[PDB]
């Protein structure tokens, strides 16, 4: 187990850095890939890349050694960088859902509505929000619990557990995960509803001569739309569900499972290159890069 667990963490960091480096390289190097949507994909890839370089590796050690080897300052700063990048990943995922919703349902309105400069502001907003959810509260100790047993971890530099007060845990989890999850569900459900209402209008248009059935394109779209909500939810719902659970009754869910679910969330950062960069221009770029 502990030999296999250590090996498993290694390729997770490899997959994350490889994928996201490949994406950023492809977008930066290809004139054809520098679209509006891929600008938001670039934000996402940056976030997930920093996860693979700094965040996950230090998280790997803390599990393998069983303790924090780099002192209370870097514990805080690593924790702040972790929360920031995860917040920015999840919120950028949410922006992309919106961008594709508008690009598919209202394509002509969207072109005038969304400029490159407007997208840049949106990206900067997301990182600013991510910063203010992460660094500002964490470095200023607004997260801290009053509890003496929690305060023993804050005093010990070898302890780098993220034990938060009730208020932070709820607010930060809502802002970074639950609100984005709802927006993604709402947004992508209108994409489903728009497509299904449009298939209805074709059946009426025929004057009762044909009834449409799901073709190749519809089955794939619904699979794709599934993968997006599926992998995102699978990866972060467990960790963020448990994150609220421990606010009420801390003993119910064990520490090993809480950390196991956080590794599942780190796995998302490896999946995002696979989900969001399958376009034929991406595929061409990836082969040209390799």
């Amino acid at each position, epitope marked *: 187990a502990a030999k296999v667990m250590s090996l498993l963490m290694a390729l997770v960091v490899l997959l994350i850095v490889a994928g996201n480096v490949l994406v950023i390289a492809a977008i930066g190097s290809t004139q054809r890939l520098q679209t509006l949507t891929n600008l938001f994909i670039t934000s996402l890839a940056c976030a997930d890349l920093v996860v693979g370089l700094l965040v996950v590796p230090f998280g790997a050690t803390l599990v393998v050694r069983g303790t924090w080897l780099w002192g209370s300052f870097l514990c805080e700063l690593w924790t702040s960088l972790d929360v920031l990048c995860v917040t920015a990943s999840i919120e950028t995922l949410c922006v992309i859902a919106i961008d594709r919703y508008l690009a598919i349902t209202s394509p*002509f309105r969207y072109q005038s509505l969304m400029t490159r400069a407007r997208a840049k502001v949106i990206i900067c907003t997301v990182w600013a929000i991510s910063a203010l959810v992460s660094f500002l509260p964490i470095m200023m100790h607004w997260w801290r619990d009053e509890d003496p047993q929690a305060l023993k971890c804050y005093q010990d530099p070898g302890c780098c557990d993220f034990v938060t007060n009730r208020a932070y845990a709820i607010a930060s989890s809502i802002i970074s995960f639950y609100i984005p999850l709802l927006i993604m569900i709402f947004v992508y459900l209108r994409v489903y509803r728009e497509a299904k209402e449009q298939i209805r209008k074709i059946d009426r248009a025929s004057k009762r001569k044909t009834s449409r059935v799901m073709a190749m394109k519809e089955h794939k779209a619904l699979k794709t739309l599934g993968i997006i909500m599926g992998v995102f939810t699978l990866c972060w719902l467990p960790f963020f569900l448990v994150n609220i659970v421990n606010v009420f009754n801390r003993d119910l869910v064990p520490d090993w499972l809480f950390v196991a679910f956080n590794w599942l969330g780190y796995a998302n950062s490896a999946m995002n290159p696979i989900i969001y960069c399958r376009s034929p221009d991406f595929r061409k770029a990836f082969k040209r890069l390799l």
Partner: nanobody
Amino acid sequence: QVQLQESGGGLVQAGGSLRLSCAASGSIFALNIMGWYRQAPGKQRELVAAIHSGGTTNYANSVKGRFTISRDNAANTVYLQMNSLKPEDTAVYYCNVKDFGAIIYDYDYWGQGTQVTVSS
């Protein structure tokens, strides 16, 4: 395969009329844009007109008020009703489908092209 069959073009007198028609045979996702682009002699391909599945429409300035892009509500077929033609409208007109079935990106289809020539 998805294939785009263009028709309705040819020679015509200035101040005249034509009605292009592109019938898209094959599997297309319900959400899409059917459009007409044109490539004038020794010039870059430009948008003429385009119509979403929803029904919103976008025309290029030159052809505003004259041309009308409509689509068959039943089939995957799009019509560009070209009125009040001028010799500058002379070009190879290409049918186009932007297919949104991947969600994150869009896949394109282009017709072979059909010649429209407007004499003075």
